[PDB]
Design a protein around this ligand. Structure first.
Ligand SMILES: Cc1cn([C@H]2C[C@H](O)[C@@H](COP(=O)(O)OP(=O)(O)OP(=O)(O)O)O2)c(=O)[nH]c1=O
Ligand SMILES: Nc1nc2c(ncn2[C@H]2C[C@H](O)[C@@H](COP(=O)(O)OP(=O)(O)O)O2)c(=O)[nH]1
Ligand SMILES: Nc1nc2c(ncn2[C@H]2C[C@H](O)[C@@H](COP(=O)(O)OP(=O)(O)O)O2)c(=O)[nH]1
Ligand SMILES: [Mg+2]
Ligand SMILES: [Mg+2]
Ligand SMILES: [Mn+2]
Ligand SMILES: [Mn+2]
Ligand SMILES: [Mn+2]
Ligand SMILES: [Mn+2]
Lengths: 683, 289, 289, 683
């Protein structure tokens, strides 16, 4: 047995009635001095290291050529001057197993944490030495963490894309379905997760050029996409991950949901394709009144009205669709559909739930389009325009397919350094650079929307870690007060940085003038309502850091109206799965699942206590399954009001609660303004 | 007083081998010596044979002769587990770890192995000797079934448990633990049915039934010793396995309401370390907060 | 060519009674007339009684005489579903809708009923007539089994499906739909086993087995018509039920590899809404001509 | 039970020890008089019928506008002047159930046989009244039958494509694989069978741009194509049919064959994708000498030589591949692979066998490319060039994908009319017209090859019917003598018509100058060997008909050298499945499977005696299974020497035949020059 995992297993050996949490420090120390320093390739000087990495196709020469070697040396000194030490064995293990650069035979270790951070910072700065040092300080202090694609691939030659979330709109044609399959395989080949909207596709039993009952529905396209994602699996190390989204008023909604039933046949069930359901407020209203709802055939609506069903407002056109004889509709029970959704989430965790009117009542770019679906992680909520891929000889009408670069603030380290403003602005700059350097040459709509919208996603993590290490319960009103103030400040500084970038570059995102930022309606609750902490305990947490007031928000509103905004979307809170270990942080803004997390890697068993877990804060680290999901919904809705995109909201369910409890949680989330619900995790 | 709780326990324990991914054992298997792999394959093949006959013959025939729809439902469920779940799981393990020729060879080896044929002959003979409305022939077959469930499997179970306890072949080991968990409750249940019949007898008849049970156990035991030596001598474990089978023989006797027959011994501590949501309709008040 | 595929489909359809909450049926049950409640009770008891024969005799007797380990496992699984799942499900539906005394009386009535008894005893008679190592008698029993699974149940299934298609008794209707889905696959599987025997026969023997199957179908069908009028005239449904019987008779025949007997008819839309030659090596000189 | 169905069923009722064959005339008469004349929409004049058909979206106004109504009336007069009578009930039933135009609700009948033939002829002539009358005489005499797509769809507004066989090359790239899936779905949507060459795709466990062992091989593409064909199911009318071809020296050949095993896993098995194996002479030579053979990884060969493995001659390149250390390979047993092929064909009829060197030793366009694979029916053998489909922004390199137009001469009717020359030339003209009028907008390589190659397929049928009705056994040497002479004449007149078309249009097919037609090497065996019948009985069959001599072939060679050749490919003998009933003909050049065909339509069973079956010729209608497959191979090889493309050659096997017998049949077919083997049908 390895010495470091033997030391790491001494955490669970209870001495004097307490877990030996200090063993993890010894565990990581032994891990380093017995595996990492031995397996680390060391060069005489940094110049030899960089030459070796560039020559052997490990790094990219173009980005390293913008700095003189003295500047690169200064950046590396800045990284190593911090003398960063991993606080736990899991942090270092995850870094050196997932993100640290290794030789071509996966034998030795080329990059330390400081080397990777310095390379990512030099990639972000794009020739600026001082900006590179600022990025080094930001990441070595672990105030900001670039997403897994960016952190893993920044500055590497044989790399995937820095963006891993893509959203595709599929038009109701065979050419568009073929192009969707092709683009899905191309993006899965790059390593990204692809989400597809299947609402514009006509339902099963619709006509294909005046021959009736000819269309196979969205389930045939679902099978096509599932096999396309199985094919493009990148060695199978990380198999192709796709998501399909369907509006709840699509006729194929029941067959769409039946693809996830355990008793589904092999000719229907999809395995590699996650599913999400988009629910307008009309469906919730119909289920609330116990009235008879109707699902519609999309092609009939398109023929009758000239627009797709999901491109229309269901809360204003549902009655017109029902009364229209030329529209084909099928009678359903909305409460039965809700119960089926709850049962499917209990048994499989699917579908993802998107509350469409919750997304679009606060959506800033409804002039471009309404948000019709989310991503594979169920937190990207941006306007999309469907493309019209025509025959080979004809020109294609390229729409807007969503993609944003992810990045997380570490709430604990940002709050410790009293650096919300600087961290948010530097992270915004880094995400803007990642957006600018991304060029997808096989997804035309993704490329066009990346150039036009310039959307970024700046998330946060370690919310529960910060609260538990500060003696605040996750369900407590003080926690929601802190989240309100913190994320209002993050929104303020992200909007300020976007406006400053627009002023400097002299350009805004496409169709900015129609957005709510340009009209000033976005800032109504910010110029009217003060978001300063209401509790003295929370107010001391922000001591030494200026909290923008209503006057500051009015000044920012004037600044945005006079200079514009560079990013259509700025903030989205992703799950942040594996980078949470490296940053020694709790995953996303969701509460922790286990206080001490037990994992098996190969034939070795190791335990990961939550960051900062001890006996003085053991009960503040309440597990997500033991807490009220209504209070978690309250917390996420408090955070969501300052986030322009969505939040990956996992529901943590006990075995005792029925499908009625899951439905009640979903309805309370819809009532409280929750935009999306990610997973129904059951213990 | 017990069938309903056994019914509930059996159905709540329902599983399929496909729930456990086996590709994780590929490396620890590759690393075993040829002797170790040979013993392992043969051990599981011997288990497969026992479950094949317990599922095809033993459990269905006992189900046929036991009165009461609930008792029959439990016995039918146990029969299904034997051949549709347990016997099949071994093929899942074989198909993962071994090439087809090695699989073909081990199944040929069960057909010609004299100890495995003898134990099958003895157990299945007793199953097929059951006479309708003859409780004594039924008791004898139930004793045979308890000895299969709680004693005979254990010369086989030893080795997967021995590896599991060292952190080796842990996915295969997980399957085996699920099988063992099932057999433990199967042995108890059939034991309780056997005791029902035994308790109806005169003292003289009881004395004869104890003689039958002990003579049968000794005969099976002596054969199992030779089987154990044949399999385990090449891996150096025969004496250890023998202690384990004696331990489990005592458990089989206890399942039959009899006193332990072998003296207690220290078992290898490695082997000891080797051991829908409810649908509720939505109310109107659920939509308001 | 087919047993592993059916194994997969069977085990992935596994379900338990507890998964469906039954109490909410009382909200539509209370609104049915006496004749509707009476017919439902009688139909339910009919299905229960026939399914018990299939669990205690039909499936286990076929599993006993069929050769092949994998077939025996699938058949065991099907027998388990009859005894452990279906039987408990029917009992649960009854206990929810009627008080104990009413259940006992309905079963007394249906137990004495001439048309239910005629078909129950005809089927059981063929199961009792199977002889060891006689594939002809096994085939005849398989035909009887397919007729029960794919045909005789459907005069009964009609009513729960009729309610289910109207939004009435939805919880018990969901249960019945799961049961029916199991019986459908049981009928198809046993049908394939019967065709295997049929295909091993001479042309004269085949013609004789066809005559047997058609003659048996005719006897059962004429009794089904009487059974149908006896139960469904009081609720005015017999005409449509008769169409459903013939449609399912045709499915049963197709399961046995036979042509449909009855002309194609449309079914009540409410019920619809509810619903290797020889490997030889090349020995050289085969490449030269 | 219908009266005609009862009358047709009285054939099996044996009266005086003989079948009542005359009951089928009564059966067809009753069928017409009781059903067809009742359900045939009648109009006061032909003008009213034509106006109703064009205005109700049944016909195309474009082709009918090319004639004055007087010319169309005279064409219809010519069709009805023959007073054509269907000889059997099955002929009329098949026509009026598959090809006759019906109302949009499929309740009444708009088109009789004469109307369909007149419309097809008017479409063929393209404005020429005399040519239209000639086509009417050719088809109403049933000397030439256009293929099912052409006959069914010509002159119809809501029609599929007139071509149903397509052959696509798939390049070793994700872009090309996605484009292949798209084109396969587009062509299956049109109703055409699609054949894909998978030999260029790199095998399983190959490197993808420095990531070794990352390719799923040809089986992942096979699954993608199978799901693509399942989705593109011709508007839910007819199941989507596709074929995949792999070279026997491809590394994935065993995985390719395992997709058709009855025990195949659901993640390996393909359902709607037929498979064909391409076998060079090198494999047969290795199996003959029992030397252990090597299958090669195609990408290693492409990297080492810059050419695809299937683009190179395996006879010269096999030793170089084996001796090259940079070419990856694994040992196989070629005899074991042959036995596996025979076992698979016995079990399921798959794969098709294409003898690569038999095709290419007589291929006339080897300069363009070698023939690497065949179609879904194993008779189309043409040169193909793989397309390089690049990224979306880049320009694709369009190659040549095979698609030929099918037509069948009725050997009995052509022979009785003594009109081999006229029928062959008119059929060539009609096939040329179909080729020119075909434009496919979503298969650029198919369209380019159709425009450039101008390849057609003129087949033949009713060979066994003609022989049995003339007292000649199919296996007799006289039958092979007749086939030799007849197909030599067909080839002569097709070459003459092609050269005449080239002279008239002043253009040949693309890259004709490199063909064996241009160099005269094609005509060597025709200017050196005499193909007149060697039997007096056969020579009497051609009485009143000039059989081309050696001097005639020399004159044709000079004419082709002077004027060129319009069609790269002219003759291919397709199976001719359903059009054989309408023509009262035996299918293709194959012998009859059964003397009397027992089929069930709806709930009523039907009986179809072979055309011309009686007491006198009962034993000349020997069933194919009772025949010696060696003699059938001899017959097909006699025909194959005059057919430039292949022949759909079905093997008819008894249940007693072993794997060795099937292998012997395959090896004798290879020895005798058979190009392709279609199916292994076992009784
Ligand atoms: C071709 C084809 C289409 N479809 C479905 C998927 C598409 O969403 C939908 C549109 O197909 P299209 O490609 O748009 O077919 P079309 O343009 O000829 O028909 P229309 O005039 O009605 O637009 O039909 C199938 O389900 N199966 C098929 O084979
Ligand atoms: N020597 C050396 N330095 C490395 C390596 N990887 C990262 N570094 C960092 C450590 C220092 O902060 C910085 C400069 O190291 P150096 O080139 O040895 O310079 P110096 O120590 O002579 O000033 O580079 C490495 O492999 N070797
Ligand atoms: N009248 C009529 N003729 C039809 C129809 N379908 C095909 N025809 C053919 C029959 C004749 O050969 C040809 C001309 O028919 P017509 O218009 O009645 O001509 P005419 O005999 O009055 O000059 O058209 C049809 O529906 N009606
Ligand atoms: Mg369209
Ligand atoms: Mg490439
Ligand atoms: Mn068992
Ligand atoms: Mn057991
Ligand atoms: Mn049942
Ligand atoms: Mn059943």
């Amino acid at each position: 047995v390895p010495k470091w995992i033997q030391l790491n297993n001494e955490i669970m050996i209870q001495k004097d009635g307490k877990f030996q949490f200090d063993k993890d420090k010894e565990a990581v120390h032994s891990y380093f001095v017995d595996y990492i320093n031995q397996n680390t390739v060391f060069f005489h000087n940094l110049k030899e290291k960089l030459d070796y990495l560039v020559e052997n196709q490990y790094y990219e020469e173009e980005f390293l050529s913008l700095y003189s070697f003295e500047d690169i040396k200064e950046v590396f000194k800045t990284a190593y001057a911090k003398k960063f030490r991993f606080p736990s064995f899991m942090s270092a293990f995850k870094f050196y197993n997932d993100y640290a650069l290794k030789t071509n035979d996966k034998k030795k270790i080329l990059e330390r944490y400081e080397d990777r951070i310095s390379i990512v910072a030099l990639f972000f700065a794009n020739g600026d030495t001082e900006k590179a040092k600022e990025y080094v300080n930001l990441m070595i202090n672990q105030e900001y963490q670039p997403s897994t694609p960016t952190f893993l691939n920044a500055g590497r030659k044989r790399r995937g894309e820095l963006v891993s979330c893509f959203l595709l709109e599929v038009n109701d044609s065979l050419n568009d379905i073929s192009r969707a399959i092709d683009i899905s395989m191309q993006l899965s080949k790059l390593g990204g997760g692809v989400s597809l909207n299947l609402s514009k596709l006509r339902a099963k039993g619709e006509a294909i050029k005046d021959v009736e009952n000819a269309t196979k529905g969205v389930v045939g396209v679902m099978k096509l996409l599932d096999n396309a994602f199985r094919y493009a699996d990148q060695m199978g190390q990380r198999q192709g991950s796709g998501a399909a989204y369907l509006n709840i008023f699509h006729r194929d909604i029941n067959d769409f949901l039946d693809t996830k039933k355990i008793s589904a046949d092999e000719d229907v069930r999809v395995k590699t394709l996650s599913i999400g359901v988009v629910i307008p407020d009309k469906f919730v209203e119909l289920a609330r009144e116990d009235k008879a709802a109707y699902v519609f055939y999309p092609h009939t609506i398109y023929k009758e009205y000239g627009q797709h069903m999901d491109e229309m407002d269901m809360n204003e056109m549902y009655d017109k669709f029902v009364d229209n004889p030329r529209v084909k509709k099928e009678k359903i029970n909305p409460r039965k559909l809700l119960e089926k959704l709850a049962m499917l989430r209990s048994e499989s965790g699917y579908p993802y739930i998107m509350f469409q009117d919750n997304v679009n009542k606060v959506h800033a770019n409804n002039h471009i389009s309404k948000v019709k679906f989310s991503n594979l992680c169920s937190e990207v909520l941006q306007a999309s325009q469907v493309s019209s891929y025509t025959d080979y000889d004809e020109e294609d009408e390229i729409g807007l397919d969503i993609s944003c670069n992810l990045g997380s603030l570490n709430i604990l380290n940002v709050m410790e350094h009293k650096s919300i403003e600087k961290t948010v602005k530097l992270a915004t700059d880094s995400l803007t650079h990642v957006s600018e350097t991304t060029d997808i040459r096989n997804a035309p709509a993704v490329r066009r929307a990346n150039k036009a919208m310039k959307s970024i996603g700046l998330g946060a993590m370690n919310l529960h870690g910060y609260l538990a290490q500060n003696g605040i319960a996750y369900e407590s009103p003080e926690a929601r007060d802190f989240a309100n103030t913190f994320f209002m400040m993050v929104n303020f500084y992200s909007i300020q940085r976007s406006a400053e970038i627009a002023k400097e570059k002299g350009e805004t995102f496409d169709q900015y003038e129609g957005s709510t930022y340009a009209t000033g309606e976005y800032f109504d609750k910010y110029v009217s309502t003060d978001f300063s902490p209401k509790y003295e305990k929370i107010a001391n947490l922000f001591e030494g850091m200026h909290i923008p007031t209503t006057e500051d928000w009015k000044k920012l509103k004037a600044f945005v109206a006079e200079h514009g905004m560079y990013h259509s979307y700025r903030l989205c809170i992703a799950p942040t799965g594996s980078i949470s270990y490296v940053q020694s942080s709790t995953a996303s803004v969701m509460p922790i699942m286990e206080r001490i997390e037990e994992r098996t890697y190969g034939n070795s068993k190791t335990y990961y206590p939550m960051p900062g877990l001890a006996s003085n804060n053991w009960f503040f680290y309440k597990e997500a399954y033991d807490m009220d999901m209504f209070k978690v919904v309250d917390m996420i809705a408090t955070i969501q009001q300052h986030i322009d995109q969505g939040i990956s909201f996992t529901l943590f369910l006990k075995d005792t609660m029925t499908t009625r409890d899951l439905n009640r949680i979903d309805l309370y989330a819809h009532h409280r303004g929750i935009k999306t619900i990610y997973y129904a995790r059951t213990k | 007083d017990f069938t309903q709780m056994f019914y509930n326990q059996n159905v709540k324990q329902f599983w399929l081998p496909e729930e456990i991914a086996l590709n994780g054992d590929l490396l620890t298997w590759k690393y075993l010596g040829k002797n170790e792999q040979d013993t392992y394959m043969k051990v599981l093949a011997g288990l497969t044979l026992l479950d094949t006959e317990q599922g095809n013959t033993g459990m269905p025939i006992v189900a046929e002769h036991v009165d009461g729809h609930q008792r029959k439902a439990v016995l039918n469920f146990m029969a299904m587990m034997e051949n549709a779940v347990h016997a099949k799981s071994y093929s899942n393990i074989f198909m993962t770890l071994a090439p087809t020729e090695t699989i073909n060879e081990v199944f040929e080896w069960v057909k010609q192995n004299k100890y495995l044929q003898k134990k099958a002959q003895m157990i299945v003979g007793l199953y097929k000797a059951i006479q309708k409305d003859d409780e004594i022939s039924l008791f004898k077959a139930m004793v045979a079934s308890v000895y299969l469930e709680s004693f005979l499997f254990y010369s086989g179970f030893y080795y997967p448990l021995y590896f599991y306890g060292q952190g080796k072949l842990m996915q295969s080991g997980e399957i085996i633990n699920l099988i063992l968990r099932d057999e433990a409750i199967h042995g108890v249940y059939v034991g309780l049915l056997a005791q029902e019949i035994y308790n109806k007898q005169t003292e003289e008849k009881k004395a004869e039934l104890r003689e039958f049970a002990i003579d049968l156990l000794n005969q099976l035991y002596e054969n199992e010793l030779e089987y154990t030596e044949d399999l385990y001598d090449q891996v150096g474990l025969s004496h250890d396995v023998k202690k384990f089978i004696r331990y489990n023989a005592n458990k089989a006797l206890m399942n039959l309401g009899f006193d332990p027959y072998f003296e207690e011994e220290d078992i290898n501590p490695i082997v000891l370390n080797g051991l829908k949501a409810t649908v509720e309709p939505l109310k109107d008040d659920d939509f308001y907060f």
